[PDB]
Amino acid sequence: PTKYEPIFVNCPLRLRSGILLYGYPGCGKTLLASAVAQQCGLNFISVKGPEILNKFIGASEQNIRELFERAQSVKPCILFFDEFDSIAPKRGHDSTGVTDRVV
């Protein structure tokens, strides 16, 4: 969609905003990401691991705000999340809402 932008500029009717990978460990999908990060030329933001959270009250929300703000303000980029489970578990939680407000 960046390589062939006149083909992709027209017809904003239907599109898909993102992709989810999963499989057995060691099936190259991290390397797929790496290659797509570098050869494509599209900017690439590497929020690897659950670094999103922060000590202070509700800092996660502000952190995600900042992250997406940088994503938008940088020219078109990929927000790379890995070990997604670490950042978006199921809805139910006995703990504080600081771990699900993020979702």
């Binding site: 390589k3 062939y4 006149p6 083909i7 992709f8 027209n10 017809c11 009717l13 239907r14 599109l15 898909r16 009250i57 809805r91 139910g92 939680h93 006995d94 504080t96 809402g97």
Partner: protein, 1030 residues
């Protein structure tokens, strides 16, 4: 240009002539007829819309004189006429022709009309008696054809234009309740209707104030002398014509309390006023608060009596703007102008009004003023916006006289001496609307039958200010609070003041205070407030100390904060309450109105003291009806839009539609709406070319642009507060969609009057819950129902935002339902996800915050509050067994309703085709197999991927094609050519040829994404849900 005007009696319509000088300048050979526009300098702040006129030459009319049929405004010819008027010709024969006209006729004439045998005879009958000639007569809206028997109701599209008997659509009506009887000309009777009475007794008449300043120009007498507009009064040609002369030098108006003097002029022809009454400016009304009129009388007073006075005293009259420190330099300066610019006549113990304005201060006029007298020019630039009174307290006659009264002052010798402050109660609004006279930013006027809170507050203050002070009065103390801001409680307090004449001391905390230094001392605020009150409270009574945004100084004890801060908090809270008591007990008539943005934040130590706090709800549609009529009033729009021609709507708007369509949750700032309307209208006006084929005379607002503006406003408010919209296309109001619709309608109806008259008093109101597989109708139903039968669809949309760490969730949900109660006809859609947690009521997530949330939600869900409340609750769940029946119990969410099953006839291939029609479709995609290749029980939600992935497949194919192309050219012209460079240079209009075909669709379908939920999940939940719903 300036033109003298006269009135003739030549039929209902006639091309009345003008002087040859004007006519020959434009009635040349370029046109067979002369058309123009006429303009009357009528009373009022602005001016009325102008009127077209048809003219012919006439030599009998003197220099620059015009004639019009006296009826065109509907008054007797004997009445005093225009001194001058404005006229301008219509250039290049650009005369518009109306498209449609409406007529109202009486029973006899209407019957005589339709009894004619043919259309042509009826048209001729219309032509003859009314003298209306096709393509030559210009008619206007609301024109009465004959007095009290027939009228033209309105015209479209233009307010005024020509009529064609075969192109302009003529509509006729009669009705039965006889409007026409009251639709007579203004000259309801002859001049001699009122019997003659001689110079017997006073024969005094009631007193009423003018609506606006009176322009000097329209005066019929000669304003030869530089009398400073000081005492002129006006009457409608009666009670004065009976006297010897209508141009008496001076008139006494009364001596009930003490004598006052006025001068009288006859009101001119086209006026609109109460019959047989006297009109005087505010300075005269000041002396007569009680509307006594006891002895108006005329005498040969002559040209002058007591022409001189020396050392004339003047004194302050209290009130906020008089005492404030900032203004004193200019305001005293301006007094010297008022008392020196022109001659004026004073009375003992009399009030002068003087205007002081717009913070136009520290703006020194000049370093020197000795050389010239040039103040008058500044007035062209100083539009006023506030008034203060000054009280002369005295008269300083030095010689001998009959009485120390009714004396002239001489700018050359009559020097002035100021003295200490005095008190005097202002005028009440119902006695005289002071603001309108001076063109101020007029505060709103309520009708006391429709707004509860203002009636309450005003009566509570009214019983106190004078009704009870004659004995012993309980100190007044009232606090205003509202769940939402901008709801106009400052307007409430100002209106109260204007209605009761009580002086208002508006101490707005934000601007006046200098707090949030958080220095080690609160003495600054205390001294500031106390000193300012002290400066003005003596000799200003009754007074209303109004603290605005009081919550900035007084606030709750956040005892978790650090010590040595809370100590200032205690200090300020207590000390403020001390001032409360001190004012209430030390002074007579202190009332202390307060206003607060949210009541809870006022500390308990202070909350108790006040009594009977007023909740100010947002206005309902009945109030909105009156506030739209206020902003859209005649000369609110015109007030400061100083453009060439005034503004108005004049027709076609329907305030019930504006009030109902989306003005709910527009609680105030309809000014935004009306200003956006003005904007669209004015833009559409000014963009007109000079030729343009047509010319608009005045700005006209239309209901379509107003609706547009309200949609825009709601959209731009959406960012501030979440608000659903109607972004739905080709999928609405399918009344026959399913068997479910009838139940929906028969359950949504009962609590509402218009579908069901019963009040649902004892009957249980209930919501509607839909249940079944996701992805097959739970959202579109809600929007459809809301927008077709209900009015508002302010869904939750945020239940997942359960709570902070503070236990505010209960308050949050309470505010959700208070927003529900706002815009009363509202339906709340529950997403039914996570805030509906309890499966068993004691096992999920400890039953913590969410258990309180659900308990509150079920408690408040339906308390059988009121049918008029209108709060409906709709929701959509996978399972009703998902919950422990805490909020699913009968009486709440009862009448459980099934989503239904589409598999019988899925009626969606058509929808697929229609949607894809926006994309290229005529490539064999239309045929059924694309859908039929999948079992007929196919999921509906999958299509919205089926199409997308197909399109993407197309884009992939074309993309691989160009990937060939580029390579080819790289081999041909050069390998170093960049892909982006190539695809830019060789770019063609055919790049959009995103080839698509059946094989693309089939490949996409068989490649990826079989469905969202197809295999067995949907089937067995569907059947089980239908079974358990019996």
């Amino acid at each position: 240009m300036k033109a003298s005007l006269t009135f003739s009696l030549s039929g209902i319509y006639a091309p009345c002539s003008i002087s040859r000088d004007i006519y020959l300048e434009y009635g040349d050979k370029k046109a067979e007829c002369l058309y123009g526009t006429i303009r009357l300098p009528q009373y009022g702040p602005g001016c009325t819309p102008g009127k077209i006129v048809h003219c012919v030459l006439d030599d009998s009319l003197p220099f620059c004189s015009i004639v019009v049929p006296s009826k065109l405004f509907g008054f007797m010819p004997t009445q005093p006429t225009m001194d001058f008027c404005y006229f301008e010709p219509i250039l290049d024969n650009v005369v518009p022709v109306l498209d449609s006209v409406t007529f109202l006729i009486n029973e006899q004439l209407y019957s005589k009309l339709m009894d004619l045998p043919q259309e042509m005879q009826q048209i001729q009958f219309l032509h003859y008696k009314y003298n209306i000639n096709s393509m030559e007569t210009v008619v206007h809206s609301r024109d009465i054809l004959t007095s009290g028997l027939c009228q033209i109701l309105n015209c479209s599209p233009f307010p005024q234009g020509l009529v064609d008997f075969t192109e302009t659509q003529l509509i006729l009506v009669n009705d039965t309740e006889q409007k026409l009887s009251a639709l007579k000309y203004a000259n309801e009777d002859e001049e001699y209707a009122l019997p003659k009475i001689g110079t017997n007794s006073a024969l005094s008449i009631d007193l009423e104030s003018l609506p606006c300043t009176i322009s000097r120009d329209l005066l019929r007498p000669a304003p030869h002398i530089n009398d400073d507009n000081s005492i002129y009064a006006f009457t409608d040609a009666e009670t004065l014509l009976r006297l010897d002369v209508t141009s008496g030098s001076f008139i006494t108006v009364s001596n009930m309390g003490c004598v006052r003097l006025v001068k009288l002029f006859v009101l001119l022809l086209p006026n609109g006023f109460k019959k047989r009454t006297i009109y005087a400016p505010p300075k005269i009304i000041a002396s007569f608060p009680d509307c006594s009129v006891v002895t108006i009388s005329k005498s040969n007073i002559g040209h002058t009596d007591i022409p001189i006075a020396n050392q004339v005293f003047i004194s302050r009259v209290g009130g906020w703007l008089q005492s404030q420190k900032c203004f004193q330099n200019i305001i005293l300066t301006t007094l010297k102008k008022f008392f020196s610019e022109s001659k004026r006549i004073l009375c003992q113990n009399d009030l002068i009004p003087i205007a002081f304005d717009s913070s136009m201060a520290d703006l020194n006029i000049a370093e020197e003023n000795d050389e010239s007298d040039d103040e008058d020019e500044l007035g062209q630039y100083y539009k006023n916006d506030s008034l203060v009174w000054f009280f002369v307290t005295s008269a300083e006659l030095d010689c001998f006289s009959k009485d120390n009264s009714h004396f002239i002052i001489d700018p050359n010798r009559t020097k002035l001496i100021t003295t200490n402050i005095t008190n005097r109660r202002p005028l009440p609004l119902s006695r005289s609307n002071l603001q309108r006279y001076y063109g101020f930013a007029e505060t709103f006027y309520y009708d006391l039958h429709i707004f509860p809170y203002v009636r309450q507050l005003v009566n509570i203050l009214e019983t106190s200010f004078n009704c009870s002070q004659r004995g012993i009065t309980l100190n007044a103390s009232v606090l205003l609070h509202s769940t939402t801001n901008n709801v106009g409680k400052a307007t409430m307090v100002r209106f109260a003041s204007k209605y009761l004449g009580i002086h208002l001391l508006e101490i707005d905390c934000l601007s006046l205070t200098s707090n949030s230094r958080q220095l080690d001392s609160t003495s600054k605020i205390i001294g500031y407030i106390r000193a300012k009150c002290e400066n003005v409270l003596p000799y200003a009574s009754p007074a209303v100390i109004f603290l605005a945004h009081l919550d900035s100084i007084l606030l709750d004890v956040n005892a978790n904060q650090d010590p040595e801060a809370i100590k200032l908090q205690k200090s300020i809270n207590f000390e403020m309450s001390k001032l409360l008591d001190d004012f209430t007990f030390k002074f007579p008539g202190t009332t202390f109105v307060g206003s607060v943005n949210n009541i809870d934040n006022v500390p308990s130590s202070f909350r108790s003291h006040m009594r009977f706090e007023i909740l100010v709800p947002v206005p309902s549609e009945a109030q909105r009806l009156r506030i739209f009529q206020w902003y859209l009033s005649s000369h609110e729009l015109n007030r400061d839009v100083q453009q060439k021609v005034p503004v108005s709507y004049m027709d076609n708007i329907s305030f019930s539609s504006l009030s109902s369509y989306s003005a709910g949750l527009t609680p105030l700032d309809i000014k935004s709406i009306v200003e956006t309307a003005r904007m669209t209208a004015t833009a559409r006006f000014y963009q007109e070319s000079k030729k343009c084929g047509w010319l608009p005379q005045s700005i006209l607002i239309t209901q379509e642009d107003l609706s547009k503006a309200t949609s825009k406003a709601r959209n731009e408010f959406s960012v501030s507060i979440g608000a659903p919209q109607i972004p739905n296309v080709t999928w609405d109001d399918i009344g026959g969609i399913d068997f479910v619709k009838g139940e929906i309608l028969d359950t949504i109806d009962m609590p509402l009057k218009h579908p069901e008259l019963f009040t649902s008093g004892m009957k249980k109101r209930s919501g509607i819950l839909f249940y079944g597989p996701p992805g097959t109708g739970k959202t579109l139903m809600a929007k459809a129902i809301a927008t077709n039968f209900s009015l508002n669809f302010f869904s939750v949309k945020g239940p997942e935002l359960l709570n902070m760490y503070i236990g505010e969730s209960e308050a949050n949900v309470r505010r959700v339902f208070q927003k529900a109660r706002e815009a009363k006809p509202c339906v709340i859609f529950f997403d039914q996800i996570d805030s509906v947690a309890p499966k068993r009521g004691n096992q999920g997530d400890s039953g913590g915050v969410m258990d309180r949330i659900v308990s509150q939600l079920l408690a408040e869900l339906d308390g059988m509050s009121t049918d008029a409340d209108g709060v409906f609750v709709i929701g959509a769940t996978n399972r009703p067994d998902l919950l422990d029946e805490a909020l699913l119990r009968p009486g709440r969410f009862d009448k459980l309703l099934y989503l239904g099953i589409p598999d019988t006839d899925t009626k969606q291939l058509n929808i697929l085709e229609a949607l894809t029609r926006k994309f290229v479709l005529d490539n064999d995609v239309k045929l059924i197999e694309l859908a039929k290749l999948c079992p007929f029980n196919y999921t509906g939600a999958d299509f919205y991927a089926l199409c997308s992935d197909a399109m993407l497949n197309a884009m992939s194919r074309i993309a691989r094609m160009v990937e060939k192309k580029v390579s080819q050219h790289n081999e041909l012209t050069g390998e170093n050519i960049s892909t982006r460079r190539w695809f830019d240079k060789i770019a063609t209009k055919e790049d959009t040829k995103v080839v698509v075909k059946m094989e693309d669709f089939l490949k996409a379908q068989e490649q990826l994404t079989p469905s969202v939920s197809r295999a067995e999940l949907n089937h067995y939940e569907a059947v089980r849900a239908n079974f358990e719903g019996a």
